[PDB]
Each structure stands twice: as structure tokens, then as C-alpha cells.
Amino acid sequence: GFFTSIGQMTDLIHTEKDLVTSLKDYIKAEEDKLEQIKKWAEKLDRLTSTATKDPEGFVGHPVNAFKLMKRLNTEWSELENLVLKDMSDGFISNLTIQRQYFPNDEDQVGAAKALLRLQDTYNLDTDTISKGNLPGVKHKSFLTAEDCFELGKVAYTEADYYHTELWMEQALRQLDEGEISTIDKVSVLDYLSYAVYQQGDLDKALLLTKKLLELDPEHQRANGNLKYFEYIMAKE
């Protein structure tokens, strides 16, 4: 367990809240820099447009050459400096310091396993867990497709292919409902086809392999699995 006391939990939860305030202040600092740069851009747009609309008049009046040489020689360097200016040091410094108190990879895996143990103990469906349809979770937390994928991957590492299958199917389900996510169906189908084969369902593993190959026709292992499944089945 990552948490060694209630006070530790309280302190970290409050710290995260404070980090959101710090993040909002960073956003304001970037917005202010960007507003400055946009003003500068508009002015430069006007200046260059004004030159091309009367080129003979432009060269004919000497303030124009003087201002143009100075702008290119000097002003664009000032603008460059502003573009390069870092606005994130305050927020990043703060986050860096607070990370002293954060959990790490081992704690995140630990927490995933504890969720899986809960699911096993009470025989909870993946959909009930993901939608937060449990007392004390409802409207507090819900799982993304990528969270489902991660829990599936954790089960996979324990050789629990039963829960691998269930969680990968849940991920795939949410992707089909139209969830925008960083995980791709090909990754989910890779694990799902493998778990289903371990669970002794030959037909289903073949089918899932075919779905994968529809999305990624040159996936090497899936092509090999396709040939393998077909060979084994032809002999039964």
C-alpha cells in the first residue's frame, strides 16, 4: 500500500488541488505572452501590406527605408527573444517539488491489482466498474478505454487471461461506442486474441485475429497466428 496514513492521503489530495491552481496560472501567463505576440504580428502585417500597396511612394520617402532596416536588423531579434521566452518555469518548478510525495510505477501497478482483487472477490462486471455504477464510486470516477487496456495488461502479466479477456473486451466496447482515446483497436485486439486463445477458444481467437488484420494487414505476429490457427483447425 502506498498510503501509510490518512494524513498523508489528505496532504497529497490537497497538494494536487493546489497544483491545478498553479496550472491555471501558467495558462494565464502563456495567454498573456501569446496576446503580445499576436499584437506584434498584426502590426507587422499592417506594415508589410502598406509597403506593397505603393512601392514607388515607399522608396520615395526616406522614413520607410530607415524603419525597414531597423525593423529587420533589430526589431525581429526582440520578437525572436519573446517567442523563445519560457513561461513554464514557475509551474514546472512547483510540480517538480511536489512530486517528492507522489506514488511511482510500482504503486500504480499495486493499485491496479487491488482493483482486480476487488473485482474477483465480488464478481463485478467490467461495465459496472468502468461506468462507476458502484456505491462510493458513482459520479466520482469512471474508466477510460485506455484504463481498461491497462487493467487488462496488468492481468496479462499475472497470467490471468480470464481477466485479460474481460478488460480488453471492455476497452474494445468503449472504442466502438465512439470514445476518443490514445489506445488503438489493433493493440487491444493483439492482447484479446492472445488471451482468448489461452482460454481455449480457437474459433474466437481466429476471428479476432482476422479483425486485427483488417486494421493492420502487415502485422507480422497476427499473420503468423492466422496461419497457425488455420493449420491447427484443419487437423481437428
Binding site: 495488461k153 496479462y156 486474441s193 492472445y194 505476429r221 488455420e230 493449420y231
Partner: peptide
């Protein structure tokens, strides 16, 4: 002849 599935990922 084909080979049995390797680990995913």
C-alpha cells in the same frame, strides 16, 4: 508450417 503465438505487446 506455422508457429504457435508469441507474447503480445
Amino acid at each position: 508450417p506455422p508457429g504457435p503465438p508469441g507474447p503480445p505487446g
